[PDB]
Amino acid sequence: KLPGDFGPPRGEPIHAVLTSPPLVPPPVNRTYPAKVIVELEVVEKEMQISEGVSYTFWTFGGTVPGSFIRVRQGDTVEFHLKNHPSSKMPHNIDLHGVTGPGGGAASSFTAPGHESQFTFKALNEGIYVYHCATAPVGMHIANGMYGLILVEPPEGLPKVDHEYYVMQGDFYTAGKYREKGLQPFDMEKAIDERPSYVLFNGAEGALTGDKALHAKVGETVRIFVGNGGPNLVSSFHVIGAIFDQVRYEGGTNVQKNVQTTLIPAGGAAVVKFTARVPGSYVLVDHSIFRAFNKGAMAILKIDGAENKLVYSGKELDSVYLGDRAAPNMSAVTKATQASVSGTLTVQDQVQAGRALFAGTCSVCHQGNGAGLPGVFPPLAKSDFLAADPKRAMNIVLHGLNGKIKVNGQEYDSVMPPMTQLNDDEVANILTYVLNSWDNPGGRVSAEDVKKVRAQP
Amino acid sequence: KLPGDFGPPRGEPIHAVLTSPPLVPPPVNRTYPAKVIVELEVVEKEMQISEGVSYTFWTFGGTVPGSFIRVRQGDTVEFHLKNHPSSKMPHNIDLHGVTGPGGGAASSFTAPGHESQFTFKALNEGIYVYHCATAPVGMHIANGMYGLILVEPPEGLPKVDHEYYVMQGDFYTAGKYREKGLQPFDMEKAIDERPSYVLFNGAEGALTGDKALHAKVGETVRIFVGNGGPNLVSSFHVIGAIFDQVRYEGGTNVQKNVQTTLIPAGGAAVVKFTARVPGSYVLVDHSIFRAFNKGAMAILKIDGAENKLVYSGKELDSVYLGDRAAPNMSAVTKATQASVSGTLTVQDQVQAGRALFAGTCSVCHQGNGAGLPGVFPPLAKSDFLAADPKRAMNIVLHGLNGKIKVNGQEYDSVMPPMTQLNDDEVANILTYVLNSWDNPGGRVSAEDVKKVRAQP
Amino acid sequence: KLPGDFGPPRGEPIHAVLTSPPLVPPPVNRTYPAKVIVELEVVEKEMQISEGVSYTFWTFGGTVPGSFIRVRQGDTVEFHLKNHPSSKMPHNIDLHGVTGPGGGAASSFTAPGHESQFTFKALNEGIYVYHCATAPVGMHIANGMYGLILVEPPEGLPKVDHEYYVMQGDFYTAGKYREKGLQPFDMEKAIDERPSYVLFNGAEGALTGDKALHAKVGETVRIFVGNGGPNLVSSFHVIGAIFDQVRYEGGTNVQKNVQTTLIPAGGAAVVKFTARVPGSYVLVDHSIFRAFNKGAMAILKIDGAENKLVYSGKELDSVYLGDRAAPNMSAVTKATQASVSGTLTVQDQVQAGRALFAGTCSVCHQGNGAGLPGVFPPLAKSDFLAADPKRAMNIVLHGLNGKIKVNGQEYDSVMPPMTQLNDDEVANILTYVLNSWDNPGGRVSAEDVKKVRAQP
Numbered sequence A, B, C: 001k002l003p004g005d006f007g008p009p010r011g012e013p014i015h016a017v018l019t020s021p022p023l024v025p026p027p028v029n030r031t032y033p034a035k036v037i038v039e040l041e042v043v044e045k046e047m048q049i050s051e052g053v054s055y056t057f058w059t060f061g062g063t064v065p066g067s068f069i070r071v072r073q074g075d076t077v078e079f080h081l082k083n084h085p086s087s088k089m090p091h092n093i094d095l096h097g098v099t100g101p102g103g104g105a106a107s108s109f110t111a112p113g114h115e116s117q118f119t120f121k122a123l124n125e126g127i128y129v130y131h132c133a134t135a136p137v138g139m140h141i142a143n144g145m146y147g148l149i150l151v152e153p154p155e156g157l158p159k160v161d162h163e164y165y166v167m168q169g170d171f172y173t174a175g176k177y178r179e180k181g182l183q184p185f186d187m188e189k190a191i192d193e194r195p196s197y198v199l200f201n202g203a204e205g206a207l208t209g210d211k212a213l214h215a216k217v218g219e220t221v222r223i224f225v226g227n228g229g230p231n232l233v234s235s236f237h238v239i240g241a242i243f244d245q246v247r248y249e250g251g252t253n254v255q256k257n258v259q260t261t262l263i264p265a266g267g268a269a270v271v272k273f274t275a276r277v278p279g280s281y282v283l284v285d286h287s288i289f290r291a292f293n294k295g296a297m298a299i300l301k302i303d304g305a306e307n308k309l310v311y312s313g314k315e316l317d318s319v320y321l322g323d324r325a326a327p328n329m330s331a332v333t334k335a336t337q338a339s340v341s342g343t344l345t346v347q348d349q350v351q352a353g354r355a356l357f358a359g360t361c362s363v364c365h366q367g368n369g370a371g372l373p374g375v376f377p378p379l380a381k382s383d384f385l386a387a388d389p390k391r392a393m394n395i396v397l398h399g400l401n402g403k404i405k406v407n408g409q410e411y412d413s414v415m416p417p418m419t420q421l422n423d424d425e426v427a428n429i430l431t432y433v434l435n436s437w438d439n440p441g442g443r444v445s446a447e448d449v450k451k452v453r454a455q456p
Ligand code: HEC
Pocket: A360, A361, A362, A363, A364, A365, A375, A376, A377, A378, A379, A382, A384, A385, A392, A395, A396, A400, A401, A402, A403, A404, A406, A411, A412, A413, A414, A415, A416, A418, A429, A430, A433, B089, B090
């Protein structure tokens, strides 16, 4: 006996349902082995990795991660891979869980415009990463070529109310985090394992705000969690909750009641969550600078009745989530498009600045700019700002400490530098500030900030 | 039924006992749920991260890690957070193990001089990291804002003879490892996950030498081990022993009889150790350059009878532990204070040099400078040293190889460069050598070493 | 009762069998405790870390990893360590699994030309890393000073058909990956955890090609897998198969049916594999850039009958494995020796280029240079190449995009830059191309490529 030895395929061939993240195909719901036909197409395309930041992704099925594949242990899978004629590269696939050399790699080699096929029996139950296997393999994986395949046990997984698909990846851009424009792949950063972004589902904000996952108090949620890498290991964590179960790949071991769990590069797990009180629960890589400085956060939003005996506090806000507490940051997307066209208005900057000011500045200076008297000075109708509004550029980039006076009050505190903000972010935030709360108005341009960043 | 559903609180409210590392509050020792009141205050302050190296830590309760909190599963916790008026930043808290959004973050936002409160029921048993959750979150965590909370099971943990509290963290200074002075936080290093120090309990030597943890042969020791990060995953290991048990957070899985175990960023474990033979057992991050080049070592010292049938060897010494085999290195602290004052004496340098020479130089040249004839040349009454004592600076910084003669004996070997030693370390070591073992005397200054480091 | 309390030693002392990787000593096959005498000698020596790249390794027993030691739980081990007189450094050992301080470190300190000994009882069953423990510890470990010791349970491990020994390590060279010559240890890279190579068994290709491990369909294979570090954690994975069992050190927990598993720095595991279909199965660190850009791949080659009902595809090839699909790359070794001697022929370059062209260029331009019409242009009898063969250097280093014509066909595609190729690699590949497929002939030298790399 090999494992998964359930019989020869019965019935008619089934054309496999593939779904785009964050959704999952439905449970196969059958008691017999089948011949399952899978057709997956590779597409190379520019998408937004962040607001106003484009990247040329290489994809299985048009998304990052690629289409989710779901079969039953014991099935025979006929796997067709098409490489769209617009592709510039050849591609192939290695599916973890396949029994055989390269997990399909050699037989699935597929030049642009061609199709390949190989067949495999699904011997091993579990959740499994797949990815491209074409030299240079790391470049293909870094450009987005990974996804998950679930091989169900024969009796199926226990019923839950929702199933979702989330996959972490590390990305390597020539430019720095949130530097606008079309960003090429950066080999030197990738070789050093120094990613510029670390993301769930292929982009900043892919699962935050209006794109959050949903469920309700009392419901159970299953998440199929993959780490496509290429390089990082995820300290995968849920803020404000606990996983009832974590199960790696097809392992016999199941861990229960943990909140933080390590996912290897190329690894995958099924986690289970029971919603107990309402609010936003954040999935992160708890190597914290990834979560909070490189994009590695996703949200499961829960609706229903508060339970004050369990938790009396308020919903997550911009103090913790920063600029991702909002529904989106499309004002940034719009202001960047407008700069590229040469049609950038003051109001474009203002609305972009407003999006960016949340968390980043509001944590100390408040949402309304009032500050807190004696502790955090006001930006609302600030005489200090008005006295030399161009010095505000230096303050953002390089910080401010020492004694100062603002609206006739003394302050002796420290504003840390925020040098990681790109020129356009600083310009837009300051332009927002100048046009709010009865401040003088005017505008700061990215060119102005650039001049100041360059001053010793 | 939610978990931890034991009843409404009974009795009088309990004011929670918080302890400073490395100690732990005592077992709650009760059979009923209580309302537990926790008061924790944030304090920003300079402390010594290393000898003569100050750092502005942000702390829960005045220490890194912060005060340890201990409650019982099923308790209702009323959590008060005070931010001391000397603070420059606002702060808050996210406690892993809390059921609710942000783990307390939004309701615990607390400006300098203010107090906040929220209430939560402790549904989940286990050991859990807490940390600040204030944008920019990574900066707050990197500056020391983390600690542990234990939620006991209802029957309590099994009795052991000692309980200790150890928490790893990664730190990001503008200066290099052991560069003296007040070191600011370095954002670029933190974003790249390139820490300058990796520490247990907030400082080099915090748990070595005279600060070691203690127990005796036959006793059981429980250690609550946290990894506050922000970024690193610890290959947590005990040198010369084994953990009887390792249990992550509140997990149902318990691993037994391992010596090396991975702790995620933001993760925590309870480990158990049974002392079997006397000596020093070293807790490290076995990503070795952290343990031996960045400070990631702590010591559990065991007293009692030798058992020669089990182990015939000698106690740990400076060959392995380097300069941390000694009780402390306070001579370095003193010599650095003296340089800052402009009052540095030759004897100050000598005693600093002596502390630093252990391991670093003594492994080859021996504790008494004799060397080993033909293999390692002597520093004790060295004619080669005396012939040009200023060339000793180049030898330390850039190494020495090739044929040489010293006290009329031939040597053809390789002394590796030690360029990572800071100017003052080299000056002090050489000054020690010059004033020991009937060498010529004199002194080398940090300015001298600086001049030589700068020569091509 | 201590654990492993089986009695005082009986019979005659046994001189321990030590084996070189990838082999393992045989099972002790005994029912009583013994006094086991172990003699291990340290040797410092230059070996090839890669083709034409020498490195001064520090070794236990002449190999990296060091000799494998196998004893029975309950044995008393008398451990002799000799440091060969040619050594320049003192050395010692810390064996995980030893009960006692330093795991032997202090008593095993051994200068060049000397011998030391200590005795220990093997209380703890499992697989355990050993390594040198001599300041600076990280340098000694980085230079190759680690290996494995197995302490068998008293009844022995279950019988399998083959046992193998594989140990990952991270290496830090002054030069870049595949830069030729004698490469010194690089401390700054090591401190930053930025390795230039990541290897199984001490070298690129140590377990690929004609050095692969072997077994047959239906056979069971046990691999003792170590991670000597010094710094990296391995996302240890088998391509195209599954581990029936993974067991860390002496842990009671055994995980089954996984394909990817995290191995800590300093950790070790026993894995079990059952061969089900023929072909090459790749052991990698699935932090992918390590596997595919730094050398972290090894091969288990399986012989026997195909099973088309399980897997219909072809054997692994150069699309996935790149230049390690071949038996070896000794043409590179030879061409590098010839350059050092000043005797490099065109044919030397051609054969080196041929080795390197596999994967690296053949994935798009094909093994025969034909390309694919309209998609990948030909290198076979290429008029575009012939028109300006020196522009081929720029194409390799810096890529090519835009519209071009080659053998009267239009192309508008993208050839990515390959700037990580060293000067000699580029020269040799191009020299191969020029002398194949009726191309013009001639040669490109490393000096030519160097001149072009230096042009802005
Ligand atoms: C985010 C991008 C912003 C922007 C646009 C500003 N800040 Fe701050 N800030 C803080 C403190 C304590 C001070 C006083 C410094 C001192 O005592 O020396 C400041 C000062 C300023 C100014 C100048 C004064 C004014 O009120 O006009 C300006 C223009 C300014 N800030 C803009 C504190 C903080 C924070 C605390 C952690 C954070 C975050 C920010 N500031 C962020 C921003």
